[PDB]
Design a protein around this ligand. Structure first.
Ligand SMILES: *[C@@H]1O[C@H](CO)[C@@H](O[C@@H]2O[C@H](CO)[C@@H](O)[C@H](O)[C@H]2NC(C)=O)[C@H](O)[C@H]1NC(C)=O
Lengths: 121, 92, 110, 41
């Protein structure tokens, strides 16, 4: 598959940002989109997740009240709304399709395709 | 704590409990109240002259031996303890 | 937290291992999955379900899991194995939560 | 002697446990996360 995401954005602190990636190559409903941040100087950090078929989200503890991951089934595009920006929210925001395999002995989950897409504040 | 407190409560209730003796053995009769939540009446067979019914058959009585004061909450015990209590010998 | 060595060293041809540690709620209960990230691009899946390997990754790479720790063995180390390797592990503290490791910068001595 | 520690843990794990009282009998509410895999309908 592939997850084509949006271009780079530049905004000052406090201005809510917009980042979206359109899912192409698979049934956008079967798999759940997850968002991941990666500060240039440091490693990956999980932003949150949300099942498109329902719309239920699982935001990380440290972005509990700042992120809004909605989706549009019609266009097969999912996007977040990070608000209350600071100087430390500059990082490349990937959107990763979370594949899953369930069977007799429990779940096993992973982020298969990944994307791209930067942001600086 | 609470968990242990109840552990000793129930252990004390069951220690020295004679399952062979009904509530108030030497006293007045014990009164058993019954409910039935009929879950289903499956098959009424005219050939076998019988029917089948699944129910939640419930009984309620008083057993002064099983009285406690040191907690207020309604106790619900694992079903395996029903082997160690006195339960009426009801039959259909 | 998923602590793993900040970096690793290896000369070509020597098997080297990246190891990650975590509580019993993330790696003990669930399965890890390693993510390579060649410098200057986006990370891509490397190992999933702690053993299996996607179509495209050579048998060169393998994964393992012992109790509350997981290890990525990079056998036959080559030049193009210079990257950062991250491990993820779904945690059961909440209904949806993953934990990415700090990352391990693997260099190729020479 | 890896077996000694395993057996010690297995024997000690059940000391004082009352299997008639659900975990958190008065402190909490027992959350049970259920899951089903239907081998055949
Ligand atoms: C034990 O169970 C009884 C029976 O359900 C509970 O009695 C009820 O208590 C509420 C108040 O908390 C009353 O409004 C109801 O009318 C009571 N029902 C009956 C049938 O008595 C009781 O609360 C439970 N706990 C204790 C400590 O008694």
């Amino acid at each position: 598959v592939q997850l084509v995401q949006s271009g780079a954005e530049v905004k000052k602190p406090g201005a809510s940002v917009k980042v979206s990636c359109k899912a192409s190559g698979y049934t956008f409903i079967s798999y759940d989109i997850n968002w991941v941040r990666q500060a240039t100087g440091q490693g990956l950090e999980w932003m949150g997740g949300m099942d498109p078929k329902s719309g239920n989200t699982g935001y990380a503890q440290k972005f509990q009240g700042r992120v809004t991951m909605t989706t549009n089934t019609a266009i097969s595009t999912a996007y977040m709304e990070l608000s209350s920006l600071r100087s430390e929210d500059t990082a490349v925001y990937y959107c990763v399709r979370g594949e899953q395999s369930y069977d007799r002995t429990g779940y096993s989950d992973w982020f298969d395709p990944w994307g791209q897409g930067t942001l600086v504040t | 704590s609470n968990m242990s407190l109840v552990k000793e409560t129930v252990d004390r209730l069951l220690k020295g409990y004679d399952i062979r003796l009904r509530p108030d053995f030497g006293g007045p009769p014990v009164a058993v109240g019954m409910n039935i939540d009929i879950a289903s009446i499956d098959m009424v067979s005219e050939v076998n002259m019988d029917y089948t019914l699944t129910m939640y058959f419930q009984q309620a009585w008083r057993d002064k031996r099983l009285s406690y004061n040191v907690i207020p909450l309604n106790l619900t015990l694992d079903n395996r303890v029903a082997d160690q209590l006195w339960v009426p010998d009801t039959y259909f | 937290v998923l602590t793993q060595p900040p970096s690793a060293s290896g000369t070509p041809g020597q098997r080297v291992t990246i190891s990650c540690s975590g509580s019993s709620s993330n790696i003990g209960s669930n399965t890890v999955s390693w993510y390579q990230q060649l410098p200057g691009t986006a990370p891509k899946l490397l190992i999933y379900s702690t053993n299996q390997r996607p179509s495209g990754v050579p048998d060169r790479f393998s994964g393992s899991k012992s109790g509350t720790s997981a290890s990525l063995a990079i056998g036959g180390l080559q030049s193009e194995d210079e990257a950062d390797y991250y491990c993820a592990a779904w945690d059961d503290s909440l209904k949806r939560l993953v934990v990415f490791g700090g990352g391990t910068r693997l260099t190729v001595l020479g | 002697d890896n077996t000694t520690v395993f057996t010690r843990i297995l024997d000690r794990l059940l000391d004082g446990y009352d299997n008639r009282l659900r975990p958190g009998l008065g402190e909490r509410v027992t959350e049970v996360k259920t899951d089903i895999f239907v081998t055949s309908f």
